[PDB]
Design a protein around this ligand. Structure first.
Ligand SMILES: OC[C@H]1O[C@H](OC[C@H]2O[C@H](O)[C@H](O)[C@@H](O)[C@@H]2O)[C@H](O)[C@@H](O)[C@@H]1O
Ligand SMILES: OC[C@H]1O[C@H](OC[C@H]2O[C@H](O)[C@H](O)[C@@H](O)[C@@H]2O)[C@H](O)[C@@H](O)[C@@H]1O
Ligand SMILES: OC[C@H]1O[C@H](O)[C@H](O)[C@@H](O)[C@@H]1O
Lengths: 160, 474, 316
């Protein structure tokens, strides 16, 4: 969506509206000053929710209302999405809560032990990436790193 | 909202019984097909159904909107519709309308193909997609023996819903030798009753009788199947002792006593040599309290071979551990006073100075087995060379043959280093075959190569072991 | 052969530890053609055994009473998910559910021919074997019934078959399973009987009611709407909802036992999940992924915040 400028933001009943330089209230997907945003039919802005525009499933941020990546549970299953609303294939995505999935070639999240980009990582039964903890896989205990989630050597206190 | 409309009486069941519904014990399944009253043949004209005109229940009914929406989306993707996205949030009316346009398209491809097998496969595929109809709702796990097959279900005695399946209150689980009376049911001493496949209820007296029938059939196999009294088995190995009801040991013991007088003499007993696969460390003492009707294994010696010779390129327990000096009081090899108050920790048979004066538990012993130091190494080798990914992975015989070539190459490595295979097998056999108070057992795979054709090629160890064996006689 | 679940190497390597017919040791096909095991025909076996006796050696039979594989006939069992010792898994909803297992033998195999045949002869010749009590059961073995065909009633269980917890079809509203065995006690969705199935949420003066796709009213059951929200409908058929000035926490005891526990229902009936809820008196509780109150443990947060829940449920 082509950008616009010179229209102020107004708050009505707890919601952000945007009124054009023309002076008309704005609906639908809009790039305002380099930020991609959405307004429903009443002209209120959407934040922290997913909307469907054209063939795209686009999440908008909870603070700014700006289009960015998320994971949506679609029907029974998780599916990742980018800033432009395209289903992601062979990519990591972090959801709103800071949890991480990796979606394979078919866009379906990987589960269990996986080797990605030469890195060993683990995923729980719901597809979420284990980070900063031990995990018993294939009759062995492995620690996965705090931010990368990569397998590394670690020590724990067993008994004393 | 009301769902009934002009198609309802047509798609309704012809009959409310087993004729018109594919079922199991009366119940229905996700992949049930049924007989509708009428059929929208070719998507044109409704015509009465004939007994063979069966249709999938999921063409017409769904357990919930989520499933309905998934069905619609799935069938759409297979050419039946412009690919669609529906959600459980979609109105019921819209989903039902969309189901009908799919039904129409289905009847058209049935006319076009003159077959319904294509649909059977489409439904089967779709059904496995749904979590309630696949393993995701089964809690697959791999710890313990669940490692083998992914987890177990225990059947229950439920006369109201599933009365054919009732056990008549006879499903006692984990009655291994140490827990034969259930007195350790609340601890880890309860036996792991579940191992593989369909676990037979050997706590049921009717099933116990049947196991004896089978036992009789084996011990008289030649008489029964070839009227050849020389083609009969002489003794038995009891597989998976700790995973069944320990009554089976007594049943087998008493049978041999009755028919062969094994309790009469050593000549009778030793004419029908019988062994147990009894891994629990407290089985030897149980077996001996029950009169040694079958020979216990002696893991204590097999274990020490692992630690001191057979396992690991370097850090190995000393040969000193083979002695078990604690057997004597203060470990005094000069004074040799047996410690009556020993902590029950030690090797089964002391051999420091065995003159045959003290009674000891009869046993068999081994270095390797078909199921010890074989199945894991052979698979580790296949995994290590990218032939399979997991130990539980399915492999083909060609996959096995290729792996075997690496296994053999490692076994016979002139460097002397072994990655999958066991070290010092000759030296191990030398000890196994000279030990007093044991019946030694020899593994085919230490004499011949474990893969390929039976006895196709001897191992490098064959000559030494063969010599040891002949020397044992002399 | 694999009717569901993970195949094991014994089976696909034909080593003989995984078998369908316990009495078939290499017999010919019924058409007359040879049908060896991996080790050869039954004649080859009798010849091998005889040869060992001619050379003064004994032959050991592998007796494998623990299990049997790949039974071709289906039955509906009642099943609970368990570990190797038959103890229920700690955090499982799979408890006393109906499941289709493969437990029934063909009834026309060598188990049918030779099953129980030799027992009568044996009881006559050695009565005491059949009169001696076994320890685990207190009972003697029972040859009054012969097993020509295996079926679930003689089994403790099975490896999971990957079929699902609800492959056997059930109505969510009443929790009754569909059945057509006897015309006196049929239960089907109303569409299939050409009756009118109404479905959805409907308000009345007393409260909110729900009708499933099969046209039945929800009573004493949890129900999920199309947007993912969960509700509980009480015995009377009404959605539970919190009132003003009253405790939103409610204790639920359902037909489905695994779901028993304390829940937090909001004024519009939505069950709180994975979050904290305050009661009328200012006490805070936490409620898990599935809506249940959590008690007597520490609990962690995505931002690394830690909380403690007392035994009575409250948060210290
Ligand atoms: O390639 C870098 C990284 O991508 C993902 O992690 C992203 C992100 O995950 C969280 O929000 C952590 O808290 C941040 O520190 C991370 O940058 C993959 O999960 C990870 O495996 C990979 O290394
Ligand atoms: O398993 C028979 C074994 O039992 C005792 O030793 C157990 C174990 O002691 C240490 O952990 C060593 O590291 C191992 O090599 C030993 O197996 C008896 O002391 C020993 O004599 C016997 O072989
Ligand atoms: O571990 C590999 C990963 O490293 C990090 C990168 O941001 C990501 O895109 C990459 O795939």
């Amino acid at each position: 969506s082509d950008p616009i400028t010179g229209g102020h933001y107004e708050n009505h009943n707890g919601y952000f509206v945007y009124i054009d330089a023309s002076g008309k209230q704005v609906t639908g997907l809009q790039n305002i000053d380099g930020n991609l945003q959405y307004f429903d039919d009443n002209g209120y802005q959407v934040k922290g929710s997913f909307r469907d525009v054209n063939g795209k499933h686009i999440y908008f941020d909870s603070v700014t209302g700006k289009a960015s990546s998320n994971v949506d549970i679609v029907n029974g299953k998780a599916q990742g999405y980018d800033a432009q609303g395209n289903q992601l294939k062979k990519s990591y995505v972090a959801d709103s809560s800071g949890q991480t999935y990796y979606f394979d070639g078919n866009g379906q999240p990987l589960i269990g032990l996986q080797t990605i980009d030469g890195n060993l990582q683990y995923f729980n039964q719901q597809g979420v990436q284990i980070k900063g903890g031990f995990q018993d896989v294939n009759n062995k205990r492995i620690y996965f790193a705090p931010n990368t989630g990569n397998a590394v050597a670690n020590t724990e206190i067993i008994n004393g | 909202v009301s769902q009934s409309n002009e198609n309802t009486p047509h798609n309704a069941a012809k009959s409310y019984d087993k004729s018109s519904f594919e079922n199991v014990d009366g119940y229905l399944t996700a992949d049930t097909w049924y007989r509708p009253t009428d059929i929208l043949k070719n998507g044109d004209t409704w015509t009465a159904s004939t007994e063979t005109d069966m249709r999938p229940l999921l063409m017409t009914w769904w357990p919930d909107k989520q499933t309905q929406a998934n069905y619609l989306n799935f069938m759409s993707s297979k050419g039946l519709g412009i690919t669609t996205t529906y959600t459980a949030a979609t109105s019921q009316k819209t989903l039902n309308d969309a189901a009908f346009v799919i039904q129409t398209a289905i009847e058209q491809q049935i006319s076009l193909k003159k077959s319904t097998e294509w649909l059977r496969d489409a439904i089967d595929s779709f059904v496995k997609t749904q979590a309630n109809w696949n393993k995701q709702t089964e809690d697959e796990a791999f710890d313990g023996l669940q490692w083998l097959q992914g987890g177990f279900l225990a059947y229950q005695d439920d006369s109201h819903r599933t009365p054919n399946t009732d056990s008549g209150n006879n499903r006692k689980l984990g009655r291994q030798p140490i827990n034969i009376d259930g007195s350790k049911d609340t601890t880890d001493g309860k036996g792991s009753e579940f191992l593989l496949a369909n676990d037979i209820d050997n706590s049921n007296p009717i099933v116990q009788a049947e196991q004896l029938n089978w036992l009789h059939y084996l011990m008289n196999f030649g008489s029964i199947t070839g009227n050849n009294d020389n083609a009969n088995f002489d003794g038995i190995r009891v597989d998976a002792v700790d995973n069944v009801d320990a009554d089976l040991l007594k049943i087998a013991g008493d049978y041999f006593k009755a028919l062969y007088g094994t309790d009469k003499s050593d000549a009778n007993a030793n004419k029908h040599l019988s062994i147990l696969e009894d891994w629990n460390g407290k089985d030897p003492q149980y077996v001996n309290q029950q009169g040694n009707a079958q020979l216990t294994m002696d893991y204590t010696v097999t274990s020490q071979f692992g630690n001191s010779l057979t396992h690991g390129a370097n850090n190995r327990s000393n040969m000193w551990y083979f002695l078990d000096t604690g057997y004597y009081l203060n470990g005094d090899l000069n004074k040799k006073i047996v410690d009556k108050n020993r902590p029950n920790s030690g090797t089964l048979v002391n051999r420091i100075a065995n003159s045959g004066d003290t009674k000891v538990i009869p046993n068999y012993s081994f270095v390797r087995a078909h199921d010890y130091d074989a199945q894991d190494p052979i698979r580790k080798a296949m995994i290590d060379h990218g032939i399979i990914k997991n130990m539980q992975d399915t492999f083909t015989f060609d996959q096995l043959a290729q792996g075997m070539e690496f296994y053999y190459k490692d076994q016979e490595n002139p460097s002397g280093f072994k990655k999958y295979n066991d070290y010092n097998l000759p030296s191990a056999y030398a000890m196994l075959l000279t030990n007093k108070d044991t019946v030694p057992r020899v593994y085919y795979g230490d004499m011949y190569l474990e893969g390929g054709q039976y006895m196709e090629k001897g191992t490098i160890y064959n000559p030494v072991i063969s010599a040891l064996l002949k020397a044992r006689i002399k | 052969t694999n009717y569901g679940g993970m195949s094991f190497l014994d089976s696909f390597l034909n080593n003989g530890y995984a078998f369908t017919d316990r009495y078939d040791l290499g017999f010919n096909k019924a058409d007359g053609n040879p049908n060896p095991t991996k080790y050869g025909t039954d004649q080859d076996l009798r010849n091998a055994i005889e040869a060992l006796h001619k050379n003064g050696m004994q032959a050991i039979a592998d007796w494998v009473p623990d299990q049997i594989y790949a039974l071709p006939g289906k039955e509906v069992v009642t099943a609970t998910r368990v570990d190797e010792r038959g103890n229920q898994l700690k955090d499982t909803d799979f408890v006393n559910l109906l499941y289709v297992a493969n437990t029934k033998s063909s009834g026309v195999d060598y188990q049918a021919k030779y099953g129980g045949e030799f027992l009568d002869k044996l009881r006559e010749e050695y009565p005491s074997l059949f009169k001696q009590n076994q320890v685990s059961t207190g009972q003697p073995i029972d040859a009054s019934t012969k097993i020509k065909q295996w079926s679930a009633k003689y089994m403790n269980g099975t490896n999971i078959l990957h079929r699902g917890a609800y492959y056997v079809l059930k109505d969510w509203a009443t929790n009754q399973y569909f059945n057509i065995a006897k015309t006196n006690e049929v239960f089907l969705p109303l569409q299939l009987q050409n009756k009118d199935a109404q479905t959805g949420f409907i308000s009345d003066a007393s409260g909110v009611k729900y009708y499933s796709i099969s046209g039945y009213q929800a009573k004493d059951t949890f129900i999920e709407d199309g947007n993912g929200n969960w509700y509980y409908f009480d015995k009377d058929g009404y959605m539970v909802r919190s009132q003003q000035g009253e405790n939103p926490i409610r204790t639920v005891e359902t037909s489905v036992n695994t779901r028993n526990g304390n829940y937090y229902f909001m004024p519009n009936g939505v069950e709180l999940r994975k979050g904290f809820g305050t009661d009328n008196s200012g006490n805070v509780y936490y409620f898990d992924d599935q809506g249940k109150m959590v008690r007597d443990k520490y609990i962690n947060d995505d931002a690394n915040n830690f909380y403690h829940l007392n035994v009575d449920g409250t948060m210290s």
